[PDB]
Each structure stands twice: as structure tokens, then as C-alpha cells.
Amino acid sequence: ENRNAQTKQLQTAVSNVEKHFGELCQIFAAYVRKTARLRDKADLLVNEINAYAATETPHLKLGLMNFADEFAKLQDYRQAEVERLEAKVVEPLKTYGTIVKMKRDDLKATLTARNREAKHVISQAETELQRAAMDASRTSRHLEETINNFERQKMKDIKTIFSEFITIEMLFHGKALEVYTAAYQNIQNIDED
Amino acid sequence: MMRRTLENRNAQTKQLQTAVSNVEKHFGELCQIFAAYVRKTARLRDKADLLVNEINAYAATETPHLKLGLMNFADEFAKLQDYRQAEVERLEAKVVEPLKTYGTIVKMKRDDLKATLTARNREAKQLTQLERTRQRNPSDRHVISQAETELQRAAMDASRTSRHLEETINNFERQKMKDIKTIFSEFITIEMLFHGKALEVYTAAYQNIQNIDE
């Protein structure tokens, strides 16, 4: 029905996703890197608490070492958060560079194929009319289905990717809460004798 | 006994200097690592702010329902970053700065040990010089009397100093224990508060992202 409008609609949708998913990808990747750098410093904190504990009196040494044990455990969970974020948030967003490329390549091929084939006067005009009618019908069916699928998949994927980010963070914060709730007690039960 | 007071003065001096050096080394290391931890937490907060901005920028381009859901998620995530910033500031105030104060506490302890040791060095010179004088004129009634006066005074000063050292050691250690418990209790409480707020924000954000395809 409207080739200029369907074409523009598809190019605008794929280009918008390309730009914004690509930007989300690199910021998520940076967020993951910063999370790992925080985990490095927490690891140094584990090592120093144990090194100081080693020099101290029994009750204080024990309480600090027990706290270091919990805090070290938390940093294994942080490392697992780091790895799940890269696997389930960053990598799927990076995959959209390829999806967008395939969508553009299919649009170009769609219009090139119908063009290649196209390349008395009344009979010639009738054959070209018939061909144009067939191609208009097939191309507009195809463009419509490509647009509708792209948009449905983009929504599914956005929901998945942000739902995974949120799930991964909730699980880490949930573990952190229960570790810190435990660690509080053994710092508090360091007997001042 | 004088033998015991002089021995206990020397043992307490060594005990205090060893403890002061230990606290200095390890509290100073904790100080700079906690400070680095706070900095990395702020750097993560920076990256999260940029994500807020890009989620909003992408939402601005989108269809009604999807725009609404993404901007709602960005608001929640931005509020989380305000809590992270408050975590950063409280860690600095209640964990890093109390550890940093120990550089001053340690400096004051060392200055006092140095002051005591220079006084003891001056007194020891005086005492050995007086004994050299006595050996060179041992029947001098006035040197005999100076020596008797110096014996009593040094004995009294040894007792007062070891009494001083004992209270200084006991205060430093009692305070060190109180402070380390306070500092680690604050760190845990501050994090536990952030993690609880984060869990509560994400639980809301999760439920709302799921209605995005509606």
C-alpha cells in the first residue's frame, strides 16, 4: 500500500534500536567493570582484616576473622553478579548489532531482488503492470511482517534484558543483606575480655 | 621493690610502643582501603547515573507504554543512586574519618613516648655524672647528700611513670577496642541499610518492568 512509509518506518526502528541498544551495552559494560573494581577493593579489605586480626587478642581476632569470612563470601557473590550481568545483559545487547545488520541487509536485498528481475509498447506495459502489482503485494506483506516481528521481538528482548538485570541485582542484594545481618552479630559479640 | 618498678617501666614502654605501631600500621591500611572502597562505590554510582540518562534517552524515542515503563524504571534506579550516594557519604563520615583520626592519636602517643625518653636520657646523664663525681670525691658530705636525694627521687619517678604507663596502655587498648567495634558496626549497618533499600527498589522495579508488554 505505501512503500515509502513502510521503508522509512523500518529504517527508523532499526536505527533507533541500533543507537540506543548500543549505548546501553557500553554503559552496562562499564557498570559491570566498576562493580568488579569495587570487588577488587573489597578483596583487599578481606586480606587486611585477617592480617590485622592475626596480631590481636583472641576474642578480637576471632570476631574479625569471622567477619572477614562472611565479607569474603559476599565478594564471591559479587563476582557471580559480575559474571551474570555480562552474560545476560551486556552480551544480548551486543547481539543487537548483528540483528540490526541482518534487518538492513534483508531490506536492501528485498528491494534489489525485485529490482534485478524488473531489469509492442502496450504488451510491454501490461507485463510490467502485472509484475509491479505482484511485487507490490509481496513486498508490502513482507515489510509489514518484518516491521511487526522486529518490534514484537524488541519489546520481548527489552523486557528480558531489564528483567535479568533486576533479577541479578535483587539476588545479590538479598545475599548481602543476610551476610551483613549475620556479620553484625559476631562483631557485636566480640567479648571485651 | 625498685628492681621491679624499673623492670615494669621498661616493659610497659615496650608494650605501648609495639601496640601503637601495630595500630598505626593496620588502622592506616584499613583507612586507605576503606577509602578506596568508598571511591569505587562512587565510581559505580557515576556509571549508574549515566545508565539512568541513557534509559531516559531511549524511552523518549519509544511508543507510549514502553516509554512509560522505561522512564518509571529510570526514576526508581535514579532514586537508588541517591541512596548509594548517601551510602558513600556515610561510609566516609563514619568509617574512613574515624580510622584517619588514628593517625593523630598515634602521633600524640609517639610524641609522648619521645618526650618521656628524652627526659629519661637527661636524668640518666645526671645520675651517671653524679656517680662519677662521688667516685672522685667519695667523702664529700654534700655529694653523698645529693646522691641520697637523687636515689629517692628516681625511685619515686619510676613508680609514678609505670603507674602512668599502665593507665595509658589500658586507655589506649580499651578505646581501640571500642572504636574498632564502632567502626565495623557502622560499616555493616551502613551497607545493610543500602542493600535493604536496593532490594526494596528493585522489587518494585521488577513488578513494573513485567507490565511493559501490556
Author numbering:
A (entry chain A): 7 to 125, 142 to 215
B (entry chain B): 1 to 214
Q: What do the authors of the reporting publication say about this deposited model?
A:
By determining the crystal structure of the FAM92A1 BAR domain, combined with atomistic molecular dynamics simulations, we uncover that FAM92A1 interacts with phosphoinositide- and cardiolipin-containing membranes to induce lipid-clustering and membrane curvature.
Thus, to elucidate the structural basis for its membrane remodeling activity, we purified and crystallized the FAM92A1 N-terminal region (residues 1–219). The crystal structure of FAM92A1 BAR domain was solved at 2.03 Å resolution. Based on the crystal structure, the region spanning residues 2–211 was coiled-coil composed of three α helices, designated as the FAM92A1 BAR domain. In the asymmetric unit of the crystals, two FAM92A1 BAR domain monomers assembled via a two-fold symmetric interface, yielding a banana-shaped homo-dimer characteristic for BAR-domain proteins. The BAR domain is finalized by a last long helix (α3) covering amino acids 142–211.
